[PDB]
RNA sequence: UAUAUAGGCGUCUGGGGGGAACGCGGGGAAGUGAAACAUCUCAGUACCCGUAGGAAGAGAAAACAAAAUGUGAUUCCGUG
RNA sequence: CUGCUGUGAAUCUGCCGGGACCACCCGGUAAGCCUGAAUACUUCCCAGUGACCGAUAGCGGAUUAGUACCGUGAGGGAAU
RNA sequence: AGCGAAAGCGAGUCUGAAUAGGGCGUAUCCACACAAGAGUGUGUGGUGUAGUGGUGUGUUCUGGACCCGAAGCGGAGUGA
RNA sequence: CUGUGGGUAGGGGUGAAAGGCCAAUCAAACUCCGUGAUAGCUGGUUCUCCCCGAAAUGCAUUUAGGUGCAGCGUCGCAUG
RNA sequence: AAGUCCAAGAGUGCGGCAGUGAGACGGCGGGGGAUAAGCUCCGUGCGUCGAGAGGGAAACAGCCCAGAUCGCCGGCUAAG
RNA sequence: AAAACACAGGUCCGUGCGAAGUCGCAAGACGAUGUAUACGGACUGACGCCUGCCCAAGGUAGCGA
RNA sequence: UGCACUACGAGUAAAGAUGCUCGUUACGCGCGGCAGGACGAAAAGACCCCGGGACCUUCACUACAACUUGGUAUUGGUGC
RNA sequence: UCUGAUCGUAUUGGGCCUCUAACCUCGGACCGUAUAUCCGGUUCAGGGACAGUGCCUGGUGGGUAGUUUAACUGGGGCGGUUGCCUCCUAAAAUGUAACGGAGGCGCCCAAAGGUUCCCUCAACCUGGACGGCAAUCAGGUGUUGAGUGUAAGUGCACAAGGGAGCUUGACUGCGAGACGGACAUGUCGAGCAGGGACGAAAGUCGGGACUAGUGAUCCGGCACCUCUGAGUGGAAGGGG
């Protein structure tokens, strides 16, 4: 009475790695995603696998534009 | 193999510089592409094997 | 008696000028085609051993 | 059988067996370790055979070494 | 450096070694012998020693001890 | 005195076409500059870095290795 | 059928064949030796007080009742 | 931002030493089952036992109250 | 303790004779002081019963009890 | 053979209670009998699983004995 | 010796027939010998350069020996799995078991890659020879329901979908800083230089819209290198 099922895949730890208002260094990953759940705005770039990474030191921000959630890096002012 | 690993070597310095899979059915001949040869420090036409 | 030193580790790990233990990365010997040059460059070099196995490697090297 | 020898006869001198370890030569395991196992290790140990000596074995370069104007049989210790 | 089986050289412009091999250099001079001292061990004997045991210990054996006794035998083996 | 596979060089070396970035090392600290605030760095100065040999303790290594315990393996001998 | 005297000895014997018998044991006898065999297995592990105080999870495993690393304890050190 | 801050006897890092890696049950959310099992497999800064006495539940590790430094022939009280 | 082993009987195979075979590293030993009417191995296990037209090439030829 | 001035019912409990709870019954001590309990004694379950072993089979692996095939030494002469 | 048939003589192997002196005979007769079925010796008779034995070598070989013959598992076997990718389970961060529910992978593409530029489908309605429900064409409606090489999901109409021009970045030397993490693995990466592609430039290009298409170490093969080279120069081997 064998079972045809039983297989699965590994833990691709997707999800947002830096949330709103979080201070980031350049190059850091912001979301690991499959597809285009999020888009890039200002100072945000897309990697090979639809990853989103910072392009300047700053603070993360999540907004929307034209109907698609986008991630931006607002430049923190030096106090 | 249908898609064996073929090695491409520059024509000038004859250094085996690259390797990649090519099809023997779609292209049953030795392809010729221009790649970068580090020895010559310049682009040189590269040919299979 | 004398404490023998493990060969398989004395010939796989090194000791820097301060004490770090370094090692060469794996997955770079054969089947190097289809491994993008980025991956190969990543696998080249000598990285410090993880602190987890640092003690094990130290025991193996010192005897 | 002919030379001759084997062999036979006599007489003289020696060996024979034992002994705890150690010496030299020669045969030579497996349990075990490898987390299994065969190479391998155990280990040339155990055991055995031959054979002595108060000790034995090795010993007087068909040697090492590396351009040093080199050391100068062997043995056994300590490093390496 | 060596054991067995084949084959198989020259005597100094000879021959071997210098870690495949080749040339130059360098060191020796095979296929003949003997050789003590430095060194390993205690059957036995003599004189001592012990931050060793002290009769369920220390030898199996302080007393019949390889005894009684067990086994056909090799062999095992006490107590006082 | 470290870097490098090594030749090799050396407060630096490896990589590489490149003081272009890195890797490892230049013990540490504090002051001054010159920089951008990509996380801080680059040069000046000042203090001068500390290992090693006894022995205690804990783990660990090679030996049986905290103690007891098999069935079974091998060598030599004893038994109709 | 039986007496006396003999022969066949262990990976060997003997077997009108049962894996039967070979000194109260035989799908390889006995004794001594290698030997304090090995056992991821079971048992055992001896006086006291104080302080701290777990886990039964993840990954990998010729792996699942073992083990390595991480997690969770304690102790020293550094920051706070 | 405050907050306990003569402490949670906290956190992080690195070192010596570990044990653990057979969990049970109760409340929730679920899979397997027959939406049975004192069943099985999961999540739960959920609890207790594990490793926890005391009081209640007749008796009754896992339920309710409550965390045992010792003495007192005092009071107050929890669950009941 | 038997239906099992054995057994006299049968059929194959090896052996031409310091045989074949077996013990033994070898010498050697048994077989055998024997010689294919014998020796060794192998199965079976007294005794009786088991069926015709084709069957220098006659044909489906499997009996068909 | 852990103990002892060792009842029964219904329960509870590692789920079959002389030993716990609540009730019932029972003067102390013996003798002869039965065999329903003490999960009675006996034998670290022979069944089943796990680990180790042994012996056996074979077109499992790897070796070897033995057999057999060729080169060469023993090993020679004359003729084609 | 260069381009080169045949030559004369001397050195040799094999096949075949023989011979005797090697060697062999448990065939005979004599001697040691008084006894001896031993043994050795002499001689005769047969074989005979075979056979046997030594070293080397290819086959047959449970005759014998040493061993192996996995784990999960609602006991074990039988059956069925064992790695990677996607979804649900999975309790709206990550993650999370079961012999729970579904499926795919062990590739393919020299263009289905890079870049520049342009376009918008499916379906439906109306009309048209074959031609129809569905082919090609015309008009309209048509914001995603078509498609996206390959599983499912996340996305894609700003197009990542559809066409075309040119090209090989399916680069070399690196890499701040991060994700995931027992460890070993695994992913992302702006930007710097060299030399290229496309484009007027700005710019994009370190393979494919993303996620599977893979296997540590050891050992060895093949090309190049300012490495090393067992006295020295080389070479052998080693090293990158």
Kindly determine whether the C-beta of residue C50 is less than 7 Å away from any atom of nucleic acid strand H. Answer: no
Q: CA of B20: which chain C residue's CA is closest?
A: C33
Q: For chain B, how many residues are written?
A: 49
Using DSSP bridges, classify how beta strands A44-46 and B42-48 pair: parallel, antiparallel or unpaired. unpaired
Element counts in chain C: helices (H) and strands (E): 3, 3
Which residues lie near nucleic chain G, judged by CB under 7 A? C 52-53, 55-56
Provide the 10 A C-beta neighbour count for residue A71.
23
**Which residues of B sit within 8 Å Cβ distance of C?**
5, 19-21
Q: Which residue is nearest to nucleotide K87 (CA to C1')?
A: A8
* CB under 8 A, 24+ apart: contacts of A63-68: A65/A39, A65/A41, A68/A36, A68/A39
Element at A78 (helix H, strand E): none
CA angle (C35, C36, C39) in 5-degree steps: 85
Is C33's Cβ below 8 Å from some Cβ in B? yes
What resolution in angstroms does the PDB record give?
3.1
Task: Report in angstroms the alpha-carbon separations of A38 from A11, A18, A56, C62.
Answer: 21, 13, 18, 52
Q: How far apart are CA A74 and CA A58, in angstroms?
A: 6
Q: How far apart are CA C13 and CA C49, in angstroms?
A: 9
DSSP state of C17: S
Q: How far apart are CA C30 and CA B45, in angstroms?
A: 27
From chain C, the residues in CB contact with B5 under 8 A are 33
Provide the 10 A C-beta neighbour count for residue B42.
10
Q: How far apart are CA A73 and CA A59, in angstroms?
A: 5
């Amino acid at each position: 009475s064998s079972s045809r099922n039983g297989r699965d895949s590994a833990a691709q730890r997707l999800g947002v790695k830096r949330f709103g208002g979080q201070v980031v260094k350049a190059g850091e990953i912001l979301v690991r995603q499959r597809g285009t759940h999020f888009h890039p705005g200002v100072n945000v770039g897309r990697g090979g696998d639809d990853t989103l990474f910072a392009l300047a030191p700053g603070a993360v921000e999540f907004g929307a534009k034209r109907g698609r959630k986008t991630v931006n890096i607002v430049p923190v002012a030096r106090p | 193999d249908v898609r064996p690993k073929i090695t491409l070597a520059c024509e000038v310095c004859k250094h085996r510089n690259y390797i990649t899979k090519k099809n023997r059915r779609n292209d049953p001949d030795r392809l010729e592409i221009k790649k970068f040869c580090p020895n010559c420090g310049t682009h040189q036409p590269h040919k299979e094997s | 008696p004398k404490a023998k030193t493990h060969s398989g580790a004395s010939k796989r790990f090194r000791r820097t000028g301060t004490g770090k233990i370094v090692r060469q990365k794996a997955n770079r010997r054969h089947l190097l085609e289809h491994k993008p040059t980025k991956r190969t460059r990543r696998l080249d070099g000598r990285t410090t051993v993880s602190a987890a196995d640092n003690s094990r490697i130290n025991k193996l090297l010192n005897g």
